[PDB]
């Protein structure tokens, strides 16, 4: 009954369904950096070489 | 809704506009007892000066602000400082609170002073206005015609004049049978609560005189007084 008290008082802030109102309405980030780097290294190389 | 317009009009010199504001304040305090506190010293300065003419009303309002906050001490000095506006307090039965607070303050003081001299009511030190509020609370119980709430209250507060006069008005001798009762209840009470010599002795001595005044009295009661006070003179 301590637990029951918690859930009831809380309800008015939760209203109808602050639980399902919202969904009814609606290095790990960084992309493949291998590709960028591949191309960088060859673009450097080329110039280096013909200089 | 907000009390800030009311606050603002008070500063204006014009008396007609300030007085009308007080009256408006008095009916929003209930809730607004918060915003008004920031500006409460202005309301206080208008009472403190004799310059003002609506003084009693201004103190009354400051009291209500202290009461709601719960800073009781100031609330009671400001009630007694308006001097009138008390019929207002009486027609609220949800503020008899401050009256009681006044009872609390009295009882402490009186009891202390009693030992030096039994009398102290009239005394300059014990503000006369406070004296009277004490008797008023007691007077309510006596409109309702129960003598037991009335004595009760007096006892704690070390008030001998009151106890004399109460007892006497019902020592009209309707019968021996009833006279006899009243005395006996007063002995049992006095004995087991008040153990202070001087106050107890005084109560008992009175109870002696009353039966003694009367030519026909039971003797059972009379032996008890004599022994307990261990007073050969009676």
């Amino acid at each position: 009954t301590k637990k029951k008290n918690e859930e009831i008082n809380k309800k008015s802030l939760e209203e109808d369904d602050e639980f399902e109102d919202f969904p009814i309405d609606t290095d790990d980030v960084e992309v493949d950096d291998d590709f960028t780097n591949e191309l960088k290294a060859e673009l450097d190389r080329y110039k280096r070489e013909n200089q | 809704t907000t009390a800030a317009p009311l606050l603002a009009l008070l500063r204006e010199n014009q008396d007609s506009v300030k007085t009308y504001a007080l009256e408006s304040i008095n009916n929003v305090v209930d809730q607004l007892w918060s915003e008004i506190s920031n500006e409460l010293p202005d309301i206080e300065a208008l009472y403190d000066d004799d310059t003002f003419s609506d003084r009693e009303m201004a103190a009354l309002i400051a009291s209500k602000v202290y009461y709601n906050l719960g800073e009781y001490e100031s609330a009671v000095k400001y009630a007694l400082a308006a001097k009138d506006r008390f019929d207002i307090d009486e027609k609220s039965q949800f503020v008899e609170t401050i009256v009681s607070k006044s009872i609390e303050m009295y009882v402490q003081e009186a009891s202390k002073q009693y030992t030096k001299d039994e009398q102290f009511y009239t005394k300059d030190i014990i503000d006369p206005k406070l004296t009277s509020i004490f008797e008023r609370m007691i007077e309510k119980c006596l409109k309702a015609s129960e003598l037991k709430l009335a004595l009760g209250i007096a006892l704690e507060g070390y008030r001998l004049d009151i106890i004399e006069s109460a007892l006497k008005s019902k020592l009209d001798q309707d019968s021996t049978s009833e006279n006899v009762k009243i005395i006996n209840y007063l002995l049992t009470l006095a004995i087991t609560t008040v153990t202070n010599s001087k106050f107890r002795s005084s109560i008992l001595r009175k109870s002696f005189d009353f039966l003694m005044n009367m030519p026909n009295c039971d003797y059972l009661t009379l032996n008890k007084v004599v022994v307990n006070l261990n007073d050969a003179g009676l």
Partner: protein
């Protein structure tokens, strides 16, 4: 059909009623009626769904009717009346027993048994009304009866324990009526709503009943918040008597929720932290309680970003409140990377979701922060960075502009740099090392003081259980 089910329902109520009637009338066993009343409310709500919910109709029919009768008739009127046994006193089966109430003495007026029974009946009625979704007339009528009904009586420690529930429904029901529909009447009655709560609180200071104080104060904060009346809330909080000691932990968590909200908006963030962290731990993790939790996490996300912290990504990675918290998450990202153009797009697209929760206003203010985090980054990286390079990168207006960002940022000391105008670059000055400083002492003071408080709580709690079982019979 009707008869059987109705009858069982009445019995069930009668059983409950009898328990609490024996309990309440004997000395100061306060805790017992209080735990019992709570459980009961839950049991009753759960009950209604099967074997009818005309328990209310029954339950009126077999008790003394002081004004119960008038309400019941109104309720029947609302859902189209019927009569079948629906007037109270139509079965006399109390029979002047003491348990079902001594029928004659209630009438004689020598004694009053109806008092506490009527508070309890109002609770039961109120719960059914909200469960049902009986709005308009009932809601108004219920409020109109109950306010003067309570001011008719004189409170006791036991009566105080009961109105701690009743005042929640008086509030809630009114809110529901604003939430149906806009009326010109709703604007007037909002004022009246505040007024009756405020009066009852004053008296309840004098009863020194913490239960009711705490309940009341939470309701009162929620109303000021809807009208955005911070100035009036600020004085209100300075009253200081909102108890914590006796109160249930739910009332501490709604109170702290409100504290976070009101502090954050008036441009206090430091203290606002303590309050939101505390409010999450106190809340339970219950299945019905998940709705509260999302709301608390929306707000937390905001508080932190303003302060200059980065909520862990990790914390939000394994959460399941995902779909609702998508807007917030993108804000965190914008701040963390310092990316200027991203930020703006993020708040325009999501505007409507953000507005509902009223996190939005906090979100505009993180605009200063986007820039600052992005300057934090350039400093950590670079010891001398020409101011000319910073002006291109963050696409800043003029050379004067780039200076002013850094100038103001170092006032809170977030970046700690020095600008050289003439040499035309910034040189990092950052201490980095603070072990050397006096600071390590201060951090540890908080750690130690929290720890010591936990030992005291333990001691006091440990002995109490053991006494109770030792008294009881045992081997």
């Amino acid at each position: 059909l009707h008869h059987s089910e109705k009858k069982y329902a009445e019995e069930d109520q009668v059983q409950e009623l009898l328990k609490v009637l024996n309990e309440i009338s004997k000395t100061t066993l306060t805790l017992d009626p209080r735990y019992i009343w709570r459980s009961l409310k839950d049991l009753s709500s759960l009950r209604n769904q099967e074997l009818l919910n005309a328990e209310t109709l029954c339950f009126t029919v077999n008790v003394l009717y002081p004004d119960s009768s008038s309400f019941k008739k109104n309720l029947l009127k609302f859902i189209t009346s019927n009569h079948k046994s629906s007037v109270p006193g139509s079965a006399e089966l109390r029979n002047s027993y003491p348990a079902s109430f001594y029928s004659v003495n209630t009438e004689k007026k020598t004694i009053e048994v109806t008092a506490e029974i009527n508070c309890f009946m109002h609770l039961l009625v109120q719960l059914f009304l909200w469960d049902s979704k009986e709005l308009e007339q009932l809601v108004e009528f219920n409020r109109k009866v109950v306010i003067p009904n309570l001011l008719c009586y004189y409170n006791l420690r036991s009566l105080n324990l009961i109105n701690a529930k009743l005042w929640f429904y008086i509030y809630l029901s009114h809110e529901t009526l604003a939430r149906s529909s806009e009326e010109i009447n709703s604007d007037n009655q909002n004022i009246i709503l505040r007024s009756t709560m405020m009066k009852f609180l004053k008296i309840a200071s004098l009863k020194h009943d913490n239960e009711t104080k705490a309940m009341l104060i939470n309701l009162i904060l929620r109303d000021f918040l809807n009208n955005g009346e911070v100035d009036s809330a600020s004085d209100f909080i300075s009253k200081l008597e909102y108890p914590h000691t006796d109160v249930s932990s739910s009332l501490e968590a709604r109170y702290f929720f409100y504290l976070s909200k009101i502090n954050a908006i008036q441009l206090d963030y430091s203290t606002a932290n303590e309050y939101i962290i505390a409010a999450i731990r106190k809340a339970p993790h219950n299945s019905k309680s998940l709705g509260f939790l999302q709301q608390s996490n929306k707000l937390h996300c905001c508080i932190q970003l303003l302060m200059g912290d980065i909520p862990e990504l990790s914390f939000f990675h394994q959460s399941n409140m995902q779909k609702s918290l998508l807007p917030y998450y993108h804000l965190t990202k914008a701040v963390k990377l310092g990316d200027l153009k991203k930020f703006t797009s993020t708040i325009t697209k999501y505007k409507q979701l953000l507005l509902k929760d009223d996190t939005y206003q906090l979100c505009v203010r993180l605009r200063s922060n986007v820039i600052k985090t992005g300057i934090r980054i350039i400093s950590l990286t670079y010891k001398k960075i020409s101011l000319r390079d910073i002006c291109l990168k963050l696409n800043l207006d003029s050379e004067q502009t780039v200076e002013y960002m850094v100038s103001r940022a170092i006032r809170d000391g977030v970046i700690e740099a020095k600008i050289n105008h003439e040499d035309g670059f910034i040189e990092t000055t950052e201490l980095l090392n603070i072990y050397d400083s006096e600071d390590p002492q201060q951090v540890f003071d908080e750690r130690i003081k929290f720890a010591n408080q936990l030992h005291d709580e333990y001691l006091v709690s440990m002995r109490y259980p053991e006494d109770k079982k030792t008294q009881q019979n045992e081997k």
